[PDB]
Amino acid sequence: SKGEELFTGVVPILVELDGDVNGHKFSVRGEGEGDATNGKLTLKFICTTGKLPVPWPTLVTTLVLCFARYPDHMKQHDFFKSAMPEGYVQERTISFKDDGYYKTRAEVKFEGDTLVNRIELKGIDFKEDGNILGHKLEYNYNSHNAYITADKQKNGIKSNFKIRHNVEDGSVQLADHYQQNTPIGDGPVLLPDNHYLSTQNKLSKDPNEKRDHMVLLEFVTAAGITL
Numbered sequence: 001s002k003g004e005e006l007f008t009g010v011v012p013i014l015v016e017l018d019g020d021v022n023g024h025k026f027s028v029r030g031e032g033e034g035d036a037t038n039g040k041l042t043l044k045f046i047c048t049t050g051k052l053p054v055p056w057p058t059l060v061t062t063l064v065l066c067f068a069r070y071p072d073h074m075k076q077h078d079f080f081k082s083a084m085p086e087g088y089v090q091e092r093t094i095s096f097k098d099d100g101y102y103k104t105r106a107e108v109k110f111e112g113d114t115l116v117n118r119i120e121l122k123g124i125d126f127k128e129d130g131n132i133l134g135h136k137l138e139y140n141y142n143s144h145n146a147y148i149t150a151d152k153q154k155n156g157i158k159s160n161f162k163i164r165h166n167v168e169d170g171s172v173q174l175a176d177h178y179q180q181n182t183p184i185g186d187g188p189v190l191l192p193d194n195h196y197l198s199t200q201n202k203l204s205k206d207p208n209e210k211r212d213h214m215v216l217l218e219f220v221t222a223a224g225i226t227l
Contacts, residue, residue, distance in 0.1 A: 001075075001078065001081055001082035001189075001190055003066075003081040003082050003083060003084035003085065004036075004075065004078065004081040004082070006081070006084050006085060006110070007036040007037075007066065007067070007081055007084075008036075008037065009035065009037070010033050010034065010035045011033060011034055011035070011067075011113070011114075011115050012031070012032075012033050012113065012114045012115070013030070013031065013032050013033055013034050013041070013043060013064060013067075013114065013115050013116075013117070014029075014030070014031055014111070014114050014115075014116045014117070015028070015029065015030035015031070015043065015045065015063050015064075015116075015117045015118075015119070016028075016029055016030075016116070016117070016118050016119070017029075017030075017059070017062065017063060017118075017119040017120075017121055018119070018120055018121070019054075019120075019121040019122075019123070020121070020122050020123070021053060021054055021100075021102075021121070021122075021123030021124075021126060021132075021133075022100070022123060022124065022125075022126050022133065024053040024123075025049065026047060026049045026050070026052060026053055027047070027048045027049050028045050028046065028047055028048065028052070028059065028063065029045070029046050029048050030043045030044065030045035030046070030063055030216075031043060031044065032044060032216075034064060034067035034115065035067065036066065036067045036068065036069055036070075036081070037069065038069055038219070039067065039068055039069030039219045039220045039221045040067075040217070040218070040219055041064065041067055041216070041217070041218040041219075041220070042216070042217055042218075043063075043215075043216050043218075044206060044209075044213060044214070044215050044216070045059075045063060045213060045214045045215075045216065046209075046211050046212070046213045047211065047212040047213065048211075050212070051212045052212050053133070054123065054126075054132050054133070054135075055131075055132060055135050055136075055137040055139075055165070056139065056203065056214040057137055057138075057139065057140070057141055057165055057203065058094075058096070058102075058132060058137065058165065058175065059121075060141060060201055060203075060216065060218075061092070061094070061163060061175075061177060062092070062094075062102070062104050062106070062119055062121060063117070063119070063216075064108060064115060064117050065080045065090075065108075065197065065220065066080040066081050066083075066084055066108065066115065067115075067220060068080065068197055068220040068221065068222050069219075069220065069221045069222065070222045071222065071223075073225070073226075073227055074195065074222050074225050076190055076192075077190060077192035077193055077195055077222070077225065078190060078192070078222070079148075079150075079156070079157045079181065079189055079190050079191065079192055080108075080181070082188075082189045082190040083181075083183040083184070083185065083189050084109070084110060085109065085110035086109060086183065086184045086185030086187065087107060087108050087109025087110065087183075087184045087185070088107075088108055088109070088156070088181045088182060088183050088184055089105065089106065089107055089108075089181065089182050089184060090104075090105075090106045090107075090108055090179065090180075090181050091103075091104065091105050091106070091179070091180045091181070092104045092177055092178060092179045092180075093177070093178045094175050094176070094177050094178075095175070095176045096126075096131070096132060096173060096174070096175050097173065097174040097175075097176070098127075098130070099125070099126055099127050099130045099131060099132055099173070100123055100124055100125035100126035100127065100130075100132065101123065101124065101125060102121055102122065102123045103121070103122045103123075103124075104119055104120070104121045104122075105119070105120050106118060106119040106120075107184065109184060131165070131167055131173045132173075136167055136168050136169075137165045137166065137167060137168070137173060138165075138166040138167070138168055139203055140166060140203060141200075141201035141202070141203055142163070142164045142165075142166070143198070143199060143200040143201070144161065144162075144163060144164070144198075144199055145161075145196045145197070145198050145199075145223075146159055146161035146177075146196060146197050146199065147159060147160070147161065147194065147195070147196045147224075148192055148194070148195055148196060148197060149192075149194050150191040150192055150193070150194075151180065151182075152191060154180065154182050155182060155183060155189060155191070156180060156181045156182040156183065156189075156191075157180075157181050157191070157192060158178075158179060158180045158181070159177070159178075159179040160176070160177065160178050160179070161177050161179075162174055162175065162176050162177070163175040163177065193225060194224070195222055195223065195224040195225050196222070196223055196224045197220050197221065197222055197223075198220070198221045198222075198223050199218065199219065199220045199221075200218065200219045201216060201217070201218045202216070202217040202218075203215070203216060204217075
């Protein structure tokens with residue numbers, strides 16, 4: 001795709017999320033950079049409204065799959081770059097087992113030289129003293145594979161995958177994601193054969209940052225189609 005030409009080196013990233021979880025209003029700003037050469041993303045996120053009222057790990061998937069590394073023989077299956085620079089909408093429902101759910105609508109697109117992910121997030125039905133509102137999730141992240149399929153009737157892709165969030169008592173909090181993506185522009189996009197993305201996330205803290213924040217290192221690699 002011509003969009004892939006925008007990704008041959010490191011690109012600056014801006015993430016803006018406004019959220020409303022059980023009426024708790026909050027915002028997150030992230031900045032950093034991504035390189036689809038190696039699938040590497042490095043960002044720092046700040047809760048700009050105070051303490052984040054949900055656990056940082058639960059927002060990772062919401063807070064830029066155009067930076068996934070597609071191997072050469074898979075490049076004709078990279079929907080995400082093919083939609084650039086005009087971008088795509090990424091929508092999810094994320095259901096937390098035995099708890100509430102998030103609904104997210106995001107636009108991922110270039111604004112000048114910067115790849116911007118702007119998200120509106122709504123959470124409802126979260127339980128008082130549950131793992132989300134009660135911040136009972138460990139600050140860490142299990143590596144995961146998520147399968148991508150074409151959605152030809154919407155000129156886009158879809159994906160359903162689970163995140164395992166470790167709870168501090170040794171239990172696991174599942175987060176079941178249903179995802180859809182559709183191009184913003186009317187130009188041609190690549191509709192992929194079935195494949196998956198493999199993702200690792202390292203969550204850390206900036207020792208000099210006093211605000212509630214998350215330092216994230218993410219790798220995303222496409223796989224599942226062979227020579």
